[PDB]
Amino acid sequence: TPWSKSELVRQLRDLGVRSGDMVMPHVSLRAVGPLADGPQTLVDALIEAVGPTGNILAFVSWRDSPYEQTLGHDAPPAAIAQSWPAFDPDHAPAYPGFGAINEFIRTYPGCRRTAHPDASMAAIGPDAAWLVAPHEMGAAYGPRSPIARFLAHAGKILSIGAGPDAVTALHYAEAVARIEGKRRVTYSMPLLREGKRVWVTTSDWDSNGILDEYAAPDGPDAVERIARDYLARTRVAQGPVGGAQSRLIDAADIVSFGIEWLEARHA
Numbered sequence: 001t002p003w004s005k006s007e008l009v010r011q012l013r014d015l016g017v018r019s020g021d022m023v024m025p026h027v028s029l030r031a032v033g034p035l036a037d038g039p040q041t042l043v044d045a046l047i048e049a050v051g052p053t054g055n056i057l058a059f060v061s062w063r064d065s066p067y068e069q070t071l072g073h074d075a076p077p078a079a080i081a082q083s084w085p086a087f088d089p090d091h092a093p094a095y096p097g098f099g100a101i102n103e104f105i106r107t108y109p110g111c112r113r114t115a116h117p118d119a120s121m122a123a124i125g126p127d128a129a130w131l132v133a134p135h136e137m138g139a140a141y142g143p144r145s146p147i148a149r150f151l152a153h154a155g156k157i158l159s160i161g162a163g164p165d166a167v168t169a170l171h172y173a174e175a176v177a178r179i180e181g182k183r184r185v186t187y188s189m190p191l192l193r194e195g196k197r198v199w200v201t202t203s204d205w206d207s208n209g210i211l212d213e214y215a216a217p218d219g220p221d222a223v224e225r226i227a228r229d230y231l232a233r234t235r236v237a238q239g240p241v242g243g244a245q246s247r248l249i250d251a252a253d254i255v256s257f258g259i260e261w262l263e264a265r266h267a
């Protein structure tokens with residue numbers, strides 16, 4: 001039988017989601033199973049669970065981010081530079097590889113979207129505008145990003161059937177860790193700057209592997225290795241949401257752990 005909004009809200013409350021919480025979900029819809037009115041049912045359940053004073057923050061990115069095509073160039077190649085659509089936060093679809101639920105979050109009425117085309121975050125709730133801005137090129141997941149404000153706002157990570165590699169907030173630990181040899185990438189994004197398309201070239205920490213040994217195309221990256229160690233060592237609320245095994249993680253706690261994990265292992 002497909003899961004109803006009411007059943008999912010009960011499960012989320014049993015897991016520990018409280019009215020007023022600040023939640024960042026990572027969702028595998030296949031693990032959840034069938035939903036009364038499709039994925040919107042889970043979106044509706046999350047909003048009801050955090051209540052009218054709570055907030056949801058999601059890493060949605062952009063279906064058509066030209067990351068691969070501009071990576072490692074000092075400027076966008078001529079072909080992509082002339083024809084690539086500028087990032088339009090109001091209409092740009094979410095990146096499907098990070099979860100099919102994110103397109104439903106970002107089109108939710110009142111949802112705010114951050115300005116970073118590749119690292120775009122979406123937020124719902126009274127603190128949404130404060131969460132999503134600023135989000136500047138060069139500050140994808142580190143200090144001054146929405147992730148940083150999420151961590152300072154008692155954020156909780158809600159993993160619904162997602163694996164330990166999916167914990168975006170741990171890229172903040174990579175950004176701030178005092179370790180040698182940190183990898184950086186250069187890429188270009190097409191922004192809308194008062195109506196006109198402008199290409200911006202920036203560098204930032206490599207979110208596909210902060211060090212060479214975490215950068216194999218098949219992982220495990222540092223996010224995954226940190227999260228596995230953390231979950232083996234920490235009491236974490238665990239339970240079902242629909243058919244999916246779910247966890248509710250204190251975001252500040254796992255990031256602090258990840259900073260220490262990286263700094264203990266790399267001089």
Ligand SMILES: CN[C@@H]1[C@@H](O)[C@@H](O[C@@H]2[C@@H](O)[C@H](O[C@H]3OC(CN)=CC[C@H]3N)[C@@H](N)C[C@H]2N)OC[C@]1(C)O
Pocket residue numbers: 061062065067068095118119165166168207208209216217218219220221223
């Ligand atoms: C939309 N543009 C995207 C661009 O943002 C970036 O995505 C990163 C992403 O794959 C990382 O997730 C993968 O990590 C690894 C091992 N590296 C394999 C499986 C995933 N867990 C995530 N942790 C950080 C993301 N920024 O590279 C790909 C891209 C499609 O170009």
Ligand SMILES: [Mg+2]
Pocket residue numbers: 053126127
């Ligand atoms: Mg508030």
